[PDB]
Amino acid sequence: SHTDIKVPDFSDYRRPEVLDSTKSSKESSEARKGFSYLVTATTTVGVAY
Amino acid sequence: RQFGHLTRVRHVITYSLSPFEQRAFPHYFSKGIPNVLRRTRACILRVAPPFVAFYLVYTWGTQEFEKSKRKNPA
Amino acid sequence: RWLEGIRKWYYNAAGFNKLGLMRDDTIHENDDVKEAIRRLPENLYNDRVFRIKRALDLSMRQQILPKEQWTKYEEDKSYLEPYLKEVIRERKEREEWAK
Amino acid sequence: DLELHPPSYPWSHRGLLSSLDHTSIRRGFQVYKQVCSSCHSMDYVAYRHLVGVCYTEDEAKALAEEVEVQDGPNEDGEMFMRPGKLSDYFPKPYPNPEAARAANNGALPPDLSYIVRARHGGEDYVFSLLTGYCEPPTGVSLREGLYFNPYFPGQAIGMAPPIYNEVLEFDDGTPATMSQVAKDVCTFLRWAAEPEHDHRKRMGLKMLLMMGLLLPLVYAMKRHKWSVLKSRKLAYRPP
Amino acid sequence: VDPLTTVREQCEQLEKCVKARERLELCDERVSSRSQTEEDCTEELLDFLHARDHCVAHKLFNSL
Amino acid sequence: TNIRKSHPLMKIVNNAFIDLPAPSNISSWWNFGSLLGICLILQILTGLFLAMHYTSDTTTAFSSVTHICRDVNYGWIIRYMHANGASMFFICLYMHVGRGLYYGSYTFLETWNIGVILLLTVMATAFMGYVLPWGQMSFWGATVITNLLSAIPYIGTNLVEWIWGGFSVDKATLTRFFAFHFILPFIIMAIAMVHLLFLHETGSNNPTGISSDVDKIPFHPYYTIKDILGALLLILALMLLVLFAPDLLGDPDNYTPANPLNTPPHIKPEWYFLFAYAILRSIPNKLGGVLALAFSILILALIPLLHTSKQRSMMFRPLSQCLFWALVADLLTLTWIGGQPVEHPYITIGQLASVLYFLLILVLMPTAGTIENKLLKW
Amino acid sequence: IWGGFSVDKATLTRFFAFHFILPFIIMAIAMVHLLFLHETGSNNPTGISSDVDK
Amino acid sequence: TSDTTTAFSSVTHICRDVNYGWIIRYMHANGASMFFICLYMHVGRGLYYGSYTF
Amino acid sequence: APTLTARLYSLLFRRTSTFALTIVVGALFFERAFDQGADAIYEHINEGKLWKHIKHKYE
Ligand code: HEC
Ligand code: HEM
Ligand code: HEM
Ligand code: HEM
Ligand SMILES: CCCCCCCCCCCCO[C@@H]1O[C@H](CO)[C@@H](O[C@H]2O[C@H](CO)[C@@H](O)[C@H](O)[C@H]2O)[C@H](O)[C@H]1O
Ligand SMILES: CC1=NC2=C(CCCC2)C(=O)C1c1ccc(Oc2ccc(OC(F)(F)F)cc2)cc1
């Protein structure tokens, strides 16, 4: 059956914030985006200069 | 040729994560260093030997040019 | 016979086995090979498709499989030979007829 | 035709981020002025070039006024001679190259504007040449006027040793030894050939820092986007 | 008074210099002793100066 | 439906730039195309800005170039960007070609041959560029290299004087070299677009030399972000030269003005021609030497026909790999030898290196392919 | 534009450089010009659609 | 040449010393006129026949 | 309070309009800061060598 398919373990790849499977990712969503977009924003300020 | 007209593929599953769910550099040194050494060892005696040979024919020819320009004891 | 020592050596040196490829996956696709591929049965074709997908994905990561997972020299079936041989044999007949 | 290449002297501007010693330039200019400028031209350096480098506007105006230069025509239709100003270039000793040869027994003294850049070794080369004049070895002599220098190609030059102890009194009162006079003039000839030196290196530092910032940031952006693919697992599930 | 000619002497009294200076003096009183041979001694001088002025470079600029 | 696939101008951009299906696995050696484009655009801008200040008259020429570096605002940084940018171009070119050779991308015949043309055009451009400052190496380089064409029987001697527009490299030669040098980059840009037009017929090759249709990724964002990173690294290399060693890849003798009497000690072209300059000097006969120098480049057109291996890439081919790296090391030897005076041991090394160049391409690497095949029962 | 306080040395030199490059820019824009024309095809003297008689 | 001193001289040097330089020079000058004749005629067509709707 | 990166997101990086205005403000403040800071590093590395350092002697 297709019910035999279950998603592989991605623990190795995950951010620390989303490791805990019993907690909601939504707490960390505000933060995780902030970090990655800051990198992009910093880059743009540098390129601008 | 557009996406959707490339080729025929059957029964191949692909799981993947959002870049916001994961790290940019997971085990970057931990797994990176050994993989580099493996990659380097794999190609070293294909890549290196000709440049060894260049280095030798170069340093030989350079100081051969120097010796030849000196006067000979006669 | 006697060069079988070198054939086995070359096989591992070449190293397509490290990506879980068989020899006939590495054949450069000309017009004959295209036709040979086109003639493969569902099973043999989808295996080819996956083996390559796997190899390309490994190449993308600059990694190889575990040594247990490498294609053994002895277990490398020449899967494309019967199709390719006949595709070529056919074209040579048309080329003959054309003269 | 053997060859002795110069050693690498530790100049105050040797390093990647090291500027020219501008007080050394100020001295070195005077070594061109007092010693060279009666033999070598330096056509690409004007008196305005000195301002904000080794001299003030007012100092450079005084140095310019000190020299003759032709100008014209006036309304009568004649070519007169006038006191120099900032817009004037450093004046050539002779009216042409053919006149220059005659004054130096056939040999043409090269223009010094780019001599650091136009000779292998640069300031290391010139310094060795100026200080390296010595007595010839046994078995050797050139034509009467061609001197022995071990750093010149072919071992024989057509220039009289131009620098020695106290050939000039310096404006800031530095003891004018032969090696001090050579060091200073080289530092000036470096600036002559490459005025951009100090700005170039300022830009270099700012480039290295921005690249220090942007490369790992852009590299992080790369790994971020690509992380969808680096993570992915495949599965083959035939019926 | 020149710092240069002080240091040229200082460097001259090193093993690599004095051995090259002896090489120079060998052919000095080989060519100036023998009669009519077109061979000279530029080579030996340059060997000596190479070793000397390398050392001179390393500490001349301290006195300036 | 979107206005990326609809709009006639955006359609070309969307298909050749954004939604382009690219192999998942292409390496750093695939960045060099993008970098060649950046080089070309970089040369055009810097070049155009220099041309606002330069003059092609023989008397004022050297002076104008120096006037740029001393009086024109940031003229120096523009000038040395353009000179080192030309080096960066050729670095990018040989890396780009090497990729093609190693991974067998040359099987894309039209793409490849247009490449050969592009190479030859960039060469012609850069040869004539180096003349424009009108220094010693400029003038004497141009004189020796042009005058090789006199070795052609019957016509050669006329041909040379017709290029020159006189009896030596003089007033008319410099002025026309400025005009040709201005126009050619624009011709390059056109041919480069045709180059890609044929590439987008097949899509890209990859490191395996196995078809990648089963695993294509869209060009954006994957390769837009990689190409940005590449561009960044190209700018670093360029600016490291421009701001820390702008004279490193040139020659000093091009800082003294051109003198038709006074010959420089060891006259030579710029570094990126040195390999082929060495090949020229290997053959004792002059016309032979010219035909060898010409065949040292044109042989690129012959590479696809010389392909013997049943596998496309050298990835799975140890013998070819070594022979390839030998061919690279040999080219590095020819560049070194090209820079040397014509004497022992550089004559013999040069001869031996030139023999090995043509031997590697025409005999050894084809043989190696067929040996590899017979080792795989093929 | 002038590169000075009148039309002089720097103006003439840059006018030569711009005058050289611009025709090539024209050629490009002219190709885009036709690229859009071949979206619709040509108008004709009647100002009535000519699809019925091409 | 775009140098202010030699510029006028170079254009005349074309017309007098350069082989068929005159016919090239005056073709280029009248060719510029022919261009603008062609341009205004081309625009006029567009206006009269309403091709500008494209 | 949510984390600092999170505050940055909600205030500056969420609306693309604020994201761009952030970049333009930041670019100004970076430019002046970087220039002044890097110049200091350069001129300290070349203490007493520059015209800027020896200017006072002739004024
Ligand atoms: C009265 C004559 C005279 C004076 C004084 C003089 N020069 Fe020269 N210089 C020459 C001549 C003549 C040559 C050409 C030598 C030759 O080609 O053999 C020359 C050549 C040079 C060269 C070129 C060496 C080479 O590699 O070809 C440099 C550098 C140079 N001079 C610098 C100086 C400096 C620095 C000073 C003083 C601070 C100076 N000169 C003073 C006449 C002079
Ligand atoms: C101005 C010079 C050139 C430019 C701007 C240029 C541009 C490009 C670009 C953008 C690509 C796609 C990206 C890549 O794979 O690198 C490409 C691919 C290619 N170019 Fe070039 N190129 C130039 C010169 C050459 C030369 C000299 C050759 C060969 C002699 C060549 C042969 C190829 C080939 C074979 C490919 C396909 C690579 C593949 O799919 O694996 N090009 N070129
Ligand atoms: C493939 C593109 C190009 C290459 C490889 C190239 C190469 C070169 C080289 C090697 C020089 C000599 C640099 C030096 O030693 O100073 C040069 C000079 C010059 N180039 Fe280019 N060039 C290119 C495009 C252009 C374009 C498009 C223009 C003008 C529109 C231009 C204008 C000039 C000018 C005016 C000079 C003389 C100034 C100088 O010496 O820097 N070039 N070029
Ligand atoms: C270098 C300048 C130009 C070139 C090379 C050029 C080229 C062409 C060509 C080859 C055609 C198709 C043949 C024809 O109907 O004449 C065309 C059509 C057209 N051009 Fe131009 N053109 C240029 C300038 C202009 C200008 C200045 C305008 C308007 C202000 C314009 C508007 C049009 C229009 C509206 C058409 C469509 C005519 C129709 O279908 O009835 N063009 N152009
Ligand atoms: C005794 C042990 C010998 C082993 C070590 C070898 C180095 C010792 C020097 C021996 C001579 C070497 O041989 C050296 O080869 C080159 C290249 O062919 C010669 O160069 C000459 O021959 C070639 C032959 O094609 C001509 O095209 C060329 O015009 C001419 O200059 C040198 O004049 C010669 O000196
Ligand atoms: C058009 C392109 N096609 C492909 C690849 C690799 C993967 C697949 C095919 C590329 O990197 C690619 C490309 C090429 C050039 C890029 O930047 C440019 C640089 C110059 C340029 O101008 C011009 F026309 F080439 F002269 C146009 C674009 C950006 C991307």
> Which residues of D lie closer than 8 Å to C, measured between beta carbons?
229-230, 232, 234, 236, 238
Ligand nearest to the CA of G43: 4
Q: How many whole angstroms from F129 Cα to the centroid of ligand 3?
A: 5
Q: How far apart are alpha carbons I10 and H44 in whole angstroms?
A: 57
Contact between residue H10 and residue G14 where contact means Cβ atoms under 8 Å apart: no
Instruction: Please tell me if residue G44 touches chain H, with a CB cutoff of 8 Å.
Output: yes
Helix or strand (DSSP H, E) at B13: strand B12-15
Instruction: Give all chains having 3 or more CB-to-CB distances under 8 Å with chain E.
Output: B, D
Name, in order, each residue with C-beta under 8 angstroms of B59's C-beta and a sequence gap of 6 or more.
Answer: none
Residues D46-65 as b/e (b if ≥16 CB within 10 A, e otherwise) read bbbbbbebbbbeebbbebbe
Structure token pair of residue B18: 């959002």
Question: What range defines the domain where residue I12 resides?
Answer: 1-59
Amino acid at F324: F
Which among B11, B35, B39 is the nearest to C46, CB-wise? B11
Q: How many whole angstroms from H42 Cα to the centroid of ligand 4?
A: 6
* Number of Cβ within a 10 Å radius of residue D90: 25
Q: How many whole angstroms from F55 Cα to the centroid of ligand 3?
A: 13
Look at ligand 2, atom 23, and give the residue with the nearest C-alpha.
F115
Contact between residue D103 and residue D179 where contact means Cβ atoms under 8 Å apart: no
Name, in order, each residue with C-beta under 8 angstroms of B41's C-beta and a sequence gap of 6 or more.
Answer: none
Q: How far apart are alpha carbons D30 and D36 in whole angstroms?
A: 9
Sign of the alpha-carbon torsion through C23, C29, C33, C37: positive
Beta bridge partners of B12: D236
Q: For tokens 């799975």, what's the residue?
A: F316
B14 SS3 class? strand
Cα first-last separation, chain F: 49
Ligand nearest to the CA of F72: 3
Helix axes F75-102, F109-129, angle to 10 degrees: 150
Closest approach atom of ligand 4 to CA H46: 35
Sorted by where each starts, the structural domains of chain A and their CATH numbers stand as 11-49 (1.20.5.270)
Contact between residue C70 and residue C20 where contact means Cβ atoms under 8 Å apart: yes
Q: How many whole angstroms from F164 Cα to the centroid of ligand 6?
A: 37
Please pick, among F64, F227, F282, F313, the residue that the annotation labels catalytic: F227
Residue of chain D whose alpha carbon sits nearest to that of F80: D200
Which among E3, E38, E45 is the nearest to D179, CB-wise? E3
Could you write out the DSSP letters of every residue in E12-59? HTSHHHHHHHHHHHHHHHHHTTSSS-----HHHHHHHHHHHHHHHHHH
F38 SS3 class? helix
Name, in order, each residue with C-beta under 8 angstroms of D164's C-beta and a sequence gap of 6 or more.
Answer: D178
Which among I45, I49, I59 is the nearest to D21, CB-wise? I49
Nearest by Cα to F173 from F201, F222, F138, F217? F138
Instruction: Please tell me if residue I20 touches chain D, with a CB cutoff of 8 Å.
Output: no
Contact between residue D163 and residue D108 where contact means Cβ atoms under 8 Å apart: no
C-alpha pair distances (Å), F178 with each of F57, F68, H29: 10, 16, 22
Residue of chain D whose alpha carbon sits nearest to that of B17: D228
* Number of Cβ within a 10 Å radius of residue G54: 6
E2 SS3 class? coil
Q: What is the resolution of this structure in A?
A: 3.5
CB-based burial of residue F118 (10 Å sphere; 0-12 exposed, 13-18 middle, 19+ buried)?
A: buried
Total number of domains constituting chain F: 1
Please pick, among F67, F216, F226, F307, the residue that the annotation labels catalytic: F226
- What's CA I31's distance to the chain center, in Å? 5
Total number of domains constituting chain B: 1
C-alpha pair distances (Å), D94 with each of D32, D41, D113, D207: 16, 8, 16, 44
What method was applied to determine this entry? X-ray
A42 SS3 class? helix
Please pick, among F204, F282, F313, F320, the residue that the annotation labels catalytic: F204
Question: What range defines the domain where residue B19 resides?
Answer: 1-74
Helix or strand (DSSP H, E) at F366: helix F365-375
Which among B8, B12, B35 is the nearest to C53, CB-wise? B12
Amino acid at D139: G
C-alpha pair distances (Å), F7 with each of F129, F343, G22: 40, 64, 26
Look at ligand 1, atom 27, and give the residue with the nearest C-alpha.
D152
What is the Cα Rg of chain F in Å?
A: 22
Instruction: Please tell me if residue B46 touches chain C, with a CB cutoff of 8 Å.
Output: no
Mutating to test ligand 4, I would choose from H34, H42, H53 the residue with most ligand atoms within 8 A of its C-beta, which is: H42
Verify whether residue F227 is a known catalytic residue.
Answer: yes
- Contact call for B65 and F343, based on CB within 8 A: yes
D-facing residues of A in 12-41 (CB < 8 A) are: 13, 36, 39-40
Q: How far apart are alpha carbons G16 and I19 in whole angstroms?
A: 43
Helix, strand and coil percent figures for chain F, each rounded to 5? 70, 0, 25
In short, whether H41's Cβ falls inside 6 Å of ligand 4 is: no
3-state secondary structure chain D: CCCCCCCCCCCCCCCCCCCCCHHHHHHHHHHHHHHHCCCCCCCCCEHHHHECCCECHHHHHHHHHCCEEEECCCCCCCCEEEECCCCCECCCCCCCHHHHHHHCCCCCCCCCCCCCCCCCCCHHHHHHHHHCCCCCCCCCCCCCCCEECCCCCCCEECCCCCCCCCCCCCCCCCCCCHHHHHHHHHHHHHHHHCCCHHHHHHHHHHHHHHHHHHHHHHHHHHHHHHHHHHHCEEEECCC
Which among C46, C54, C60 is the nearest to D229, CB-wise? C60
Question: What range defines the domain where residue F255 resides?
Answer: 1-378
Could you write out the DSSP letters of every residue in F298-353? HHHHHGGGG---SBSSSTT-HHHHHHHHHHHHHHHHHHHHHTS-S-TTHHHHHHHH
In short, whether H54's Cβ falls inside 6 Å of ligand 4 is: yes
Residues D123-140 as b/e (b if ≥16 CB within 10 A, e otherwise) read bbbbbbbbbbbeebbbbe
Contact between residue F330 and residue F353 where contact means Cβ atoms under 8 Å apart: yes
Nearest by Cα to B20 from D152, D35, F31, A32? A32
Residue D36 assigned to a binding site: yes
Residue I12 DSSP one-character state: I
Residue D40 assigned to a binding site: yes
Ligand nearest to the CA of F226: 6
Task: List chain C residues with CB under 8 Å of B38.
Answer: 64
Residue G34 assigned to a binding site: no
Contact between residue F227 and residue F34 where contact means Cβ atoms under 8 Å apart: yes
Q: What are the strands, taking DSSP E only, across F132-180? A: none
Could you write out the DSSP letters of every residue in F8-37? HHHHHHIIIIIS-EEETT--GGGTHHHHHH
H36 SS3 class? helix
Name, in order, each residue with C-beta under 8 angstroms of A3's C-beta and a sequence gap of 6 or more.
Answer: none
Instruction: Give all chains having 3 or more CB-to-CB distances under 8 Å with chain G.
Output: F, H
Q: How far apart are alpha carbons H19 and H2 in whole angstroms?
A: 21
Beta bridge partners of D46: D89
- What's CA D206's distance to the chain center, in Å? 24
In short, whether F199's Cβ falls inside 6 Å of ligand 2 is: yes
Give the number of residues written for chain D: 239
- Contact call for B46 and F322, based on CB within 8 A: yes
Look at ligand 6, atom 17, and give the residue with the nearest C-alpha.
F34
Q: How far apart are alpha carbons F267 and F143 in whole angstroms?
A: 10
CB-based burial of residue F149 (10 Å sphere; 0-12 exposed, 13-18 middle, 19+ buried)?
A: middle
Q: How far apart are alpha carbons F355 and B56 in whole angstroms?
A: 19
How do the domains of chain D map onto residue ranges? Answer: 1-195, 196-239
Q: How far apart are alpha carbons F81 and F255 in whole angstroms?
A: 17
Structure token pair of residue F63: 């002076």
Residue of chain I whose alpha carbon sits nearest to that of D54: I51
Give me the numbers of helices (H) and strands (E) for chain I, helices first please.
3, 0
Q: How far apart are alpha carbons F60 and F157 in whole angstroms?
A: 29
Nearest by Cα to B20 from C95, A31, C68? A31
Structure token pair of residue F277: 């300059």
Residue A17 DSSP one-character state: G
Could you write out the DSSP letters of every residue in G1-54? --SSSSS-HHHHHHHHHHHHHHHHHHHHHHHHHHHHHHHH----TT-S--GGG-
- Contact call for D232 and B15, based on CB within 8 A: yes
The torsion region of residue F43 among left (phi > 0), alpha (psi -120 to 50) and beta comes to alpha
- Contact call for B58 and F346, based on CB within 8 A: no
